[PDB]
Symmetry: C2
Subunit: 81 residues, 2 copies
């Protein structure tokens, strides 16, 4: 009398280059870049919350202070713009 259906959207893992700017880029910047890549790939523009190994990253923090090259962050889609 019922079937359980798990609706799944596959993760999209993006490789985002961080340019060689003297002004270092922020976590917020990184979220924007990932959202734009998502839009380019899927036609949807997500709002994103970034975590490193389960820990929330502050948007204002600078990428090199919190991440090493080729580290992975998880970006949760919280809504669609």
């Amino acid at each position: 009398h019922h079937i359980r259906v798990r609706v799944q959207v596959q993760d999209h893992l993006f490789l985002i280059p961080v340019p060689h700017s003297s002004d270092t880029h922020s976590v917020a910047w990184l979220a924007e870049q990932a959202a734009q890549r998502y839009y380019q790939t899927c036609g949807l523009l997500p709002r994103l919350t970034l975590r490193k190994e389960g820990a929330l990253l502050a948007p204002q923090d600078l990428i090199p202070d919190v991440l090493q090259s080729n580290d992975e962050v998880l970006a949760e889609v919280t809504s669609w713009d």
Copy 2:
């Protein structure tokens, strides 16, 4: 090279679909409509049982038992 890997993740949803003979395609349509109601997006869905694709034209009792779980993968958005 300074590269960051960003894994963008969308929340899966579990729907309970009552079956009041209905096809796999019907089941996909029910799930898609629920998704649309919940999230405002209408997905195109392929259904799998334990990783194996179910043919849309197959009848639910021929491929599934009561309370079996199927994975409905979003292949695109309408």
